[PDB]
Design a protein around this ligand. Structure first.
Ligand SMILES: *[C@H](O)[C@H](C[C@@H]1CCNC1=O)NC(=O)[C@@H]1[C@@H]2[C@H](CN1C(=O)C1(c3ccccc3)CC1)C2(C)C
Ligand SMILES: *[C@H](O)[C@H](C[C@@H]1CCNC1=O)NC(=O)[C@@H]1[C@@H]2[C@H](CN1C(=O)C1(c3ccccc3)CC1)C2(C)C
Lengths: 305, 306
């Protein structure tokens, strides 16, 4: 028993992290096969970041403008190209530690592990969620760019995130590994704002199921609700609509505990309307939304990678 | 910016995890050099489990009663010995993935990452603290025994915890890598319970400093306190005593923010009196106690967002 915010084991990804230097600008890259991937803003000076023309900037570089370093070893760059907001540097050496991998794009509400790196060296691992507004609430300092986010599935590393920027509010934005941003953001140092965030309702219900599985049961009332009446209350608290697909996804946890989804929704309704009243669920005085249904099932069953 | 509960990268420990089987019992072991370390209760029957004599159980074993598996590979066990509550199986092969390592024993309040394993295979990684009562609030199902806890300092893995048992409240107990328990607990199914836990005060103060470094000041006040009047109030909420040694290690964070430790103590006294009042600090509606001063220094910027 017990329930922790848990990341995937990071070993497979640690042996893909490299340092990428272009001029004064230095960040991380991901080395897979014979290609190193990193944010395209590596080619910018600090003055260029204010209004970059990435076509013109990259045309004015060639291979010898890029220093890639794996440990002590320099990898020699032999080609360069840009796909969306990521730079692809081709190197002469294939990474011998390349895992089985996929590049995947995730949805809002889905979770992933971040391996935070500085100078090509992994420093920390943490779990987070893609917010409804397409940000992540991460922990990232200067130099963290090129740190990746991942899930593991059946030995395959599914890479889903590459870090690019921090927004004024202190939340983070980045791309998938094919360079497409999550969210209405651009890789330019200019004023940007994420929109109003919302709570991921299906994940709250999942974590309430995790609480029941671990013995926290005080919030379970004898009331019930329709899905419609639930969504009408939940919408007033900035919670996402719960769809029937979400109800279906909570199916397994509902079957495991014996608590119907809509009865857990009636429990959540009363927690929103009345409060916690000084009590805690799983060690928290607020409702947690960064565990998916599948994370609950995985952690409360012992699945290995 | 930002603030996360953050574990260490786990890859160096992942290359040391093995499965150890003895009879019908299966758990994890840690393979460092030519030794595999595991909990000694791998040798117990289900009958003796209240009152095992481990010396008597272990003398009845040969090396070939211990099946050790490293991935695909069976490691042949070629010696065995017991040190306290850990069993040390010598194997014929030194692990080529062995990191730089130490074995350390930690205090209450200090933090470590846990790599939770089943069958020799890692499931996940999380960060936790040694509680004042010598338990940890972990996430551990049956089969997780032999999962280890660690910190990494400059590519050296300091191993500090090996998991042995769950106590009735759902908290967890275990040993250092020399096999001595943290706390009064024993590897017996006799009735055991943890003592009343307390909040790690120095860690709360550190996390309030982290909140200032990331730009929140709402909970500060105009007041100061003596250390003794601080502890007299703090004890009434179940907080651990703050010592002068604790005040010293908060030094760097005090210097960075400009807020004297005893003025941050005054803020904490008012937070405990008043509550949060609908607000949050660093994403939480309670005062968090599993970030040390060193965790804050490591994770935060050196520039306060003023
Ligand atoms: C890459 O290492 C870095 C990581 C940021 C800096 C602090 N925390 C982080 O996560 N990325 C950038 O510096 C990124 C580059 C330039 C600005 N930028 C930011 O994250 C800014 C910023 C400022 C104003 C508006 C939007 C973003 C500096 C914080 C660009 C987007 C090209
Ligand atoms: C080893 O894999 C296992 C891990 C426990 C089980 C559930 N969660 C865990 O962390 N350890 C044990 O089973 C351990 C062994 C036997 C009892 N025990 C426990 O953790 C118990 C227990 C029962 C009564 C008193 C104290 C502890 C089953 C929960 C021993 C201590 C030898």
């Amino acid at each position: 028993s017990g329930f922790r915010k848990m990341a995937f084991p990071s070993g497979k990804v640690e042996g893909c992290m490299v340092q990428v230097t272009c001029g004064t600008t230095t960040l991380n890259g991901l080395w897979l096969d014979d290609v190193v991937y990193c944010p395209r803003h590596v080619i910018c000076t600090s003055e260029d970041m204010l209004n970059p023309n990435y076509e013109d900037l990259l045309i004015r570089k060639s291979n010898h403008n890029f220093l890639v370093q794996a440990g002590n070893v320099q990898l020699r760059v032999i080609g360069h190209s840009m796909q969306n907001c990521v730079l692809k540097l081709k190197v002469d050496t294939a990474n011998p530690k390349t895992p089985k991998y996929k590049f995947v794009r995730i949805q809002p509400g889905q979770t992933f592990s971040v391996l935070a790196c500085y100078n090509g060296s992994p420093s920390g691992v943490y779990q987070c969620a893609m917010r409804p507004n397409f940000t992540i609430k991460g922990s990232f300092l200067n130099g963290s760019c090129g740190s990746v986010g991942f899930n593991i599935d059946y030995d395959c590393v599914s890479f889903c995130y590459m870090h690019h920027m921090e927004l004024p509010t202190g939340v983070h934005a980045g791309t998938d590994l094919e360079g497409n941003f999550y969210g209405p953001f651009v890789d330019r140092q200019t004023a940007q704002a994420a929109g109003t965030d919302t709570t991921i309702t299906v994940n709250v219900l999942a974590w309430l199921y995790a609480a029941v599985i671990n013995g926290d049961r005080w919030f379970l009332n004898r009331f019930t609700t329709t899905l419609n009446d639930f969504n009408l209350v939940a919408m007033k608290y900035n919670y996402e609509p719960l769809t029937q697909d979400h109800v279906d996804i909570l199916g397994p946890l509902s079957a495991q505990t014996g608590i119907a989804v809509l009865d857990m929704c009636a429990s959540l309704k009363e927690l929103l309307q009345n409060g916690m009243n000084g009590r805690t669920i799983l060690g928290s005085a607020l409702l947690e939304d960064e565990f998916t249904p599948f994370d609950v099932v995985r952690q409360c069953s012992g699945v290995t990678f």
